[PDB]
Amino acid sequence: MREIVHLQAGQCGNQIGAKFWEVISDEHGIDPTGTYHGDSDLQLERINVYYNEATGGKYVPRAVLVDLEPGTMDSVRSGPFGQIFRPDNFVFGQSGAGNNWAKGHYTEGAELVDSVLDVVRKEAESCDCLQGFQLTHSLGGGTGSGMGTLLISKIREEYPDRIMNTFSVVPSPKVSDTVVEPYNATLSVHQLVENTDETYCIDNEALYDICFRTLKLTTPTYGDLNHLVSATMSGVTTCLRFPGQLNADLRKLAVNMVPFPRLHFFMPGFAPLTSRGSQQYRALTVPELTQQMFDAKNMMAACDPRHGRYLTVAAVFRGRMSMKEVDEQMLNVQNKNSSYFVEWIPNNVKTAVCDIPPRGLKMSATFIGNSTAIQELFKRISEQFTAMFRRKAFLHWYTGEGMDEMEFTEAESNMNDLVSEYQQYQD
Amino acid sequence: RRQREMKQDFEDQMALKELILQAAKEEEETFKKAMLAKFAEDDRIELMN
Amino acid sequence: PALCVNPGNPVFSCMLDPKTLHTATSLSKAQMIMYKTSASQYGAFSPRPFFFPCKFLPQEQAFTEHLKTTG
Amino acid sequence: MRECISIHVGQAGVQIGNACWELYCLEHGIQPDGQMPSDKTIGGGDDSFNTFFSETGAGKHVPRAVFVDLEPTVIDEVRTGTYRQLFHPEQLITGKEDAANNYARGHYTIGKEIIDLVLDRIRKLADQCTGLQGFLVFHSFGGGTGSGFTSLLMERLSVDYGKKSKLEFSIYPAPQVSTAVVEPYNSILTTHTTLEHSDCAFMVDNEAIYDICRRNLDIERPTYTNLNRLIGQIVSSITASLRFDGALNVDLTEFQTNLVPYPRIHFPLATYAPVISAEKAYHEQLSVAEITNACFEPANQMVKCDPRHGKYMACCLLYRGDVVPKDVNAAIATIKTKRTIQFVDWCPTGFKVGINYQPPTVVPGGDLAKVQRAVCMLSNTTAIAEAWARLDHKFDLMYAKRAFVHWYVGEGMEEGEFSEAREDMAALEKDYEEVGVDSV
Amino acid sequence: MRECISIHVGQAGVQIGNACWELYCLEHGIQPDGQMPDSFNTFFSETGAGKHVPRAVFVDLEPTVIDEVRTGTYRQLFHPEQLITGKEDAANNYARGHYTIGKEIIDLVLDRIRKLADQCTGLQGFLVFHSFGGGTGSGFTSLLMERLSVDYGKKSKLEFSIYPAPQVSTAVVEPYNSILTTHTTLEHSDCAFMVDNEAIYDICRRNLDIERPTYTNLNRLIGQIVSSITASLRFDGALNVDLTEFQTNLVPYPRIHFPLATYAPVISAEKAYHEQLSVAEITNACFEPANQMVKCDPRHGKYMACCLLYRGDVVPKDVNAAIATIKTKRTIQFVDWCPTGFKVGINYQPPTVVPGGDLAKVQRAVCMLSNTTAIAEAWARLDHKFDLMYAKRAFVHWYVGEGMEEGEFSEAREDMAALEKDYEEV
């Protein structure tokens, strides 16, 4: 009855969303052609939150897909679940961006943005009582970062009080996979720190660390990595999707965990992760989850929070569990480690339980932690940005087609203040 | 006697109400199957052309 | 009933039908989709619970004159 | 003909009410159809449901409840639970979108749109009542519809009704454990609107219920089934003088005469003395004098305040079961001779007792056993002053660094209500300091 | 309404606990569900409908010997909440027993004892035993002594201590805790007497043919001692004397109280074929010093104060003929100022018989008590063999490292020497 409109952006955005609708479908129990055939009706009583209905029970996912290169937009139409998105919603670009961000923002970004707005207001009129919007992109490319920043800039004209999340792919600290990446990344955050009410941070090499150490998978392709993050983005939007004992939807997660409106850069992780060796071995009780989420090793953004302090943390608990057990086992993470928790907030943790687990497991949980560790991330790009601006490296691909050099220096001041904002609240 | 006789038409009206909702569900599913047969015919004629 | 017996994420193949736990006071419950508030109104009646005399609380004579007028 | 409407607000209000309306149906013969069972009953002659039910022309009964939420999911389970046929289908008033832990949203922006619907529906149960006594707010302090939306009932239920004795049952946020980090903003700003507007205000923290479960009983690891089953016993024992006859009938009016010294001092505590496991219940005698000195302990008081700090102001006792009116007047002989339990200087008598006949039931699958004697002891202590001094030190660490306020400003709420509400509870906190000072 | 509380501290104490509570469980026949198949109302307390609970505590600071108690037969005969266990073992350490570990459960033990204090209306004595040999015995019992005394003051608290032998022992730095306990038993207990019982090694095979015993075969006779002391209170007699009436006659000088004697017919079935037992003849057998249960000798000592416990077919004729005929002979040296030297208690019901013990079925039995100066030589021998280790300072660091000083070590010995200077003149 209250629902979320999914909307993707870029080749990385499309490839994430093809494995996000791949994992929400048969947890609701949906065949590859769109007819509900699941077991119990409890998943059916609020199927409308992420799905939409048509003639004869043929269900339609309501996601709005945009990409500029049509050679990878057809890759998800040929996938196993490619035949459930209605093909009116595919908004293809006739030519690619070229990984310069302002092409995605000014020259060939503004050409398609009339059409992408045409399908959402057609869809949002058909919505009953809309709650939020959901976005996936990478920062590293003009197809994903440039397009999304133009969408979120003037979606705040029409839908101001709708609660927006964006699930970014921040560039990895060791190897960033584009040469002229940090011009795009530093210019993206200025449209991020004022518009988006929440934003997440998924380091690409921190997921590589998980398959390095925890799962120790032999041969992980992007199908495996997209599945590891798609479970995390299902755990957030769940307490409005099932009943629970102490529920918490997107508004209750937002107003209860950011302290100040330009301080909202998050850091997620998903709790039960086990290799094939240790799965025969592993304990399964409620303090075994507090090992996983509060391990800095199991954290899908790169920076370890031993270098900084948490402000507020979140922990939603999908499962049928004792309430006291969670509450007892949350102070005992605060007490033995009280040097990583700040002092002008009495209690830090946020509690939420939902009865229905992921399909088969006993319990599962998701951690979202607002940290000052991320200034050690944001100090890196700002130094990385200055090394290519002062000597004017790769300048003319942005100056001659878009804005002048002031927008870079303005984006420095939008970036330098935030790193000083984190540090002032660190002590 | 009167306090007894209220419960019988209570039970009778709930019984007939359940019956008419079952009839409505039956005619709706017959509609749905008729539509599905039409769309199968549509797929067939498109493939023949 | 598996996504992939070893998908990029978790998977499990089982019969939800058997994934159910019955109640002596009630019936079996799809454990796969076990009701978190299942216990809510999930019991079997026992006059054993009934305590001693039904001696209850009521005041008809009250209305007898109260419901009616007076002197 | 003594009706008593119970109105529940919020996720704490609903899930207490599910445990509350489990017990009320089970005391009488209401099965979840609402029809009492037919055993070829010639007489009938029971009018004990009339406080909490209304009899229809058919065999059904309807409760008096007004379940209210802005969150649709937890009110959706009572809609399709086993109590689907019991509640009248309009009494389960839902919202349209959740409040999400903001007092400003819960009281100004998203809580104001629903409330024009509920206050019509309270009239539809007010006119059916004949001799209505007073309401029962069940609410919380953490979230927006518990902290802010209940702040808006009290400013309009007072001017619309007036002389009806409203009672409440809050869940105070704990001094050490917590669920939310924004809740000390909610818990100061809710006092200023419930200091003036709640007649008597019982208040129970969820730490001693979290403690007495792991310690008195032989159980560990409880959930909110086991907390709200315990609170649901207290609400039945207070009201039970209206339902079943006894030696001394203490109705809902006579509590607030014998328990409140001054109109700004109306925050008593609550206990329940023979809480015990059924494996444990048959080992020990539960006598009349074994359930009072084991009720004045500091370890079994339901709020995390130690009553050896302040001095007692007024005490009230509510016995239940097979209790003679003799041995309640010899249990007092053991209490008042001790030096540990100090009463305030200007209150020599300091007690109010009550007896009722019908012994408590047990719910099937319930932790606390059946007994013969049971008592709920409502006392008014000075030592509740330290349950706020532990709170406002977690409010200045908020406000002096001015964190989490940028949410609250743009809703329709100005900054002036912060520094006003802090000094308002600081006015209340000084008033407890002066009544404990001995007058010579 | 004449309550007494009993205590089984120590590995030797729970090997009493088998025996002392087997004889308490056959004085009145007690089923292990607490329902019998009002003399029991010292120990027990009837519940709501039909169960009885003994208010007796096995107080040990390791869970192992407590879980051996629970895996014994009498699972629900002993209610497990009264019995004190500790999560971390004290292991001889008075510091860990007293200060650090015990302070977190001291409020629990005091909650328990003030919970059964409502049943404790007419209490005649808190009987305590303890060994000195570890933190099972010394420290936590000591802290209970001080805290119960500052909680009531008046109530009867008594103690019949256990003491280390000169020849053999379990731990051998144990004289530290023995000196400390001799200093701290003088404060807050009405009484402290003789379950020091090294000589039960001698008695259990000297008299009853059971070579290769355990502590349990000894501790049958320690339980039989307990029966003779408190049975006059528990059952009606001709000239019965209770425990408050004991305390108002037993103690000449208020810091000077330590006797020595036995239960007299410690006799098996093999001698019980032939020995025609008489009250006179069994006390004739008893007055010989070599069958004591305190390793000392009052034959060469001064028979100062006395007491006598009689059970069964006892006649005032028999007891008074025995008193006269042994008062004649100076083979027992009598004492200077005190002329007579006997006091009597009489019990109708003869003592019950427990299988698996040393003894046998008796028509009647006698005892004695003989409070002498024969503990002066034993404390002189403990003075002779304590200073060897306090010359060169053994094991002090383990005590010191958790919350104590060398000051208590340097005070307790001089207080014990003060008690010896009390003892040397009389």
XYZ file of N, CA, C and O in Angstrom, chain A residues 137-142 144-146 168-171 181 184-185:
64
model
N 24.043 3.103 -8.822
C 24.953 3.517 -9.885
C 26.372 3.307 -9.404
O 26.613 3.102 -8.216
N 27.307 3.398 -10.337
C 28.711 3.566 -10.002
C 29.122 5.015 -10.200
O 28.593 5.720 -11.061
N 30.073 5.457 -9.377
C 30.618 6.796 -9.526
C 31.594 6.893 -10.684
O 31.875 8.000 -11.154
N 32.100 5.764 -11.169
C 33.278 5.764 -12.015
C 33.070 6.084 -13.475
O 34.060 6.164 -14.208
N 31.839 6.276 -13.928
C 31.571 6.393 -15.347
C 30.530 7.439 -15.677
O 29.610 7.706 -14.905
N 30.677 8.015 -16.871
C 29.743 9.019 -17.341
C 28.382 8.473 -17.706
O 27.420 9.243 -17.791
N 26.851 6.122 -15.777
C 26.178 5.945 -14.506
C 26.178 7.162 -13.607
O 25.132 7.541 -13.072
N 27.345 7.778 -13.418
C 27.433 8.902 -12.493
C 26.841 10.173 -13.081
O 26.193 10.945 -12.366
N 27.069 10.419 -14.371
C 26.567 11.637 -14.984
C 25.061 11.649 -15.139
O 24.414 12.668 -14.881
N 25.724 3.704 -4.122
C 26.827 3.992 -5.013
C 27.873 2.892 -4.962
O 27.912 2.075 -4.043
N 28.723 2.878 -5.982
C 29.938 2.078 -5.976
C 31.108 3.049 -5.961
O 31.522 3.562 -7.006
N 31.603 3.340 -4.769
C 32.749 4.237 -4.589
C 33.992 3.583 -5.185
O 34.092 2.342 -5.170
N 34.884 4.336 -5.838
C 36.098 3.728 -6.389
C 37.002 3.150 -5.317
O 37.120 3.683 -4.212
N 38.872 8.806 -13.739
C 37.822 8.558 -12.755
C 37.643 9.694 -11.741
O 36.490 10.115 -11.546
N 35.278 12.576 -12.254
C 33.877 12.190 -12.197
C 33.423 11.966 -10.763
O 32.290 12.299 -10.407
N 34.297 11.406 -9.924
C 33.880 11.057 -8.571
C 33.747 12.290 -7.694
O 32.803 12.393 -6.901
